[PDB]
Design a protein around this ligand. Structure first.
Ligand code: 2G6
Ligand code: CA
Ligand code: CA
Ligand code: CA
Ligand code: CA
Ligand code: ZN
Length: 316
């Protein structure tokens, strides 16, 4: 809506206070005009009709329990925008500063979050498996990264291309978490997953097998559940990404780590220049090798490490 840019203050899902960019016109709206063509956050009001209503608040203070998921969806969308712009020179998910829209309070007891083709959507969780999912910066960045993927590589959401799609969202979700630098790790969703259990997470990139996901191509899921295992086989690529960044010896194969910034550069370039909607794991390896070659040279350590990492997870 048309109005003037303002700065509100509120508390997120985990009880942390933060400033948020808002817009004043009669009400204060969760509309951040400081980034691209805006970041807009909506109330889905426990319904499934989207987007719901643009979040309106009387006083620009967002400390109510009901406000918390909105505060975090809005704020972490801003951090994710900043990551893509500052680190990769990418302006929003389409590269042209498309408005970023999110809805919170989607459905009832909803243990998931998603990109629906046009916007981000966050459940509140059931309080057992999840608390409101926008409380995780890696989750928010995971969702916005689906939009980036859809506008670029266009990876079809099934089988190997879908597992790459998932891994790309976990990788950049994690790199955004490191960018913000608050309790960063190589785990996925730990801040909002299972409030009754400390120290777990939905997935692990450093050790996918800890939560049942394969860490080697020979252990890939070949069934039909989960669109052919997109959230399962992502572990194979997540592990390769982890190894490229941090190094390690995995199934006897040693990888020299090159750090998270170079991981990000290599995978961003692969995603935006080389991957196609039907890319499989072998084709991702080739894309990553080519990207590292473009950036660092064919004889580089970076290229050598990409090859070792994919070798370690059994992808040729
Ligand atoms: C990062 C986590 C917290 C959320 C993450 N959500 P996601 O974006 O991968 C779910 N998305 C999804 O299924 O998209 C498919 C889709 C396409 C088009 C329109 C609508 C939906 C996830 O791993 N979901 C799976 C969760 C489960 C079922 C394993 C608990
Ligand atoms: Ca208020
Ligand atoms: Ca963390
Ligand atoms: Ca994390
Ligand atoms: Ca937990
Ligand atoms: Zn996903």
């Amino acid at each position: 809506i048309t109005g003037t840019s303002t700065v509100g203050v509120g508390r997120g899902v985990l009880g942390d206070q933060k400033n948020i960019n808002t817009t004043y016109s009669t009400y204060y709206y969760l509309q951040d005009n400081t980034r691209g063509n805006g970041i807009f956050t909506y109330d889905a009001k426990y319904r499934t009709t989207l987007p719901g209503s643009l979040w309106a608040d009387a006083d620009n203070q967002f400390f109510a329990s009901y406000d918390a998921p909105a505060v975090d969806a809005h704020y972490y969308a801003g951090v994710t925008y900043d990551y893509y712009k500052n680190v990769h020179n990418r302006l929003s998910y389409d590269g042209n500063n498309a408005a970023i829209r999110s809805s919170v309070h989607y459905s009832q007891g909803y243990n998931n979050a998603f990109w629906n083709g046009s916007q981000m959507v966050y459940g509140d969780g059931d309080g057992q498996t999840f608390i409101p999912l926008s409380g995780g910066i890696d989750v928010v960045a995971h969702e916005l990264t689906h939009a980036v993927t859809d506008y670029t590589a266009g990876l079809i959401y099934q089988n190997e291309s879908g597992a790459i799609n998932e891994a790309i969202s976990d990788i950049f979700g994690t790199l955004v978490e490191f960018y913000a630098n608050k309790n960063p790790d190589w785990e996925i969703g730990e801040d909002v997953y299972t409030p009754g259990i400390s120290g777990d997470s939905l997935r692990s990139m450093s050790d996918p097998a800890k939560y049942g996901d394969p860490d080697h191509y020979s252990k890939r899921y070949t069934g039909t559940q989960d669109n052919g295992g997109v959230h399962i086989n992502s572990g194979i690529i997540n592990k390769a990404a982890y190894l490229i960044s941090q190094g390690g010896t995995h199934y006897g194969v040693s990888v020299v780590g090159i750090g998270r910034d170079k991981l990000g550069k290599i995978f961003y370039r692969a995603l935006t220049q080389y991957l196609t909607p039907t890319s499989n794991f072998s084709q991702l390896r080739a894309a990553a090798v080519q990207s590292a070659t473009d950036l660092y040279g064919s004889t580089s350590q970076e290229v050598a490490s990409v090859k070792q990492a994919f070798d370690a997870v059994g992808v040729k």
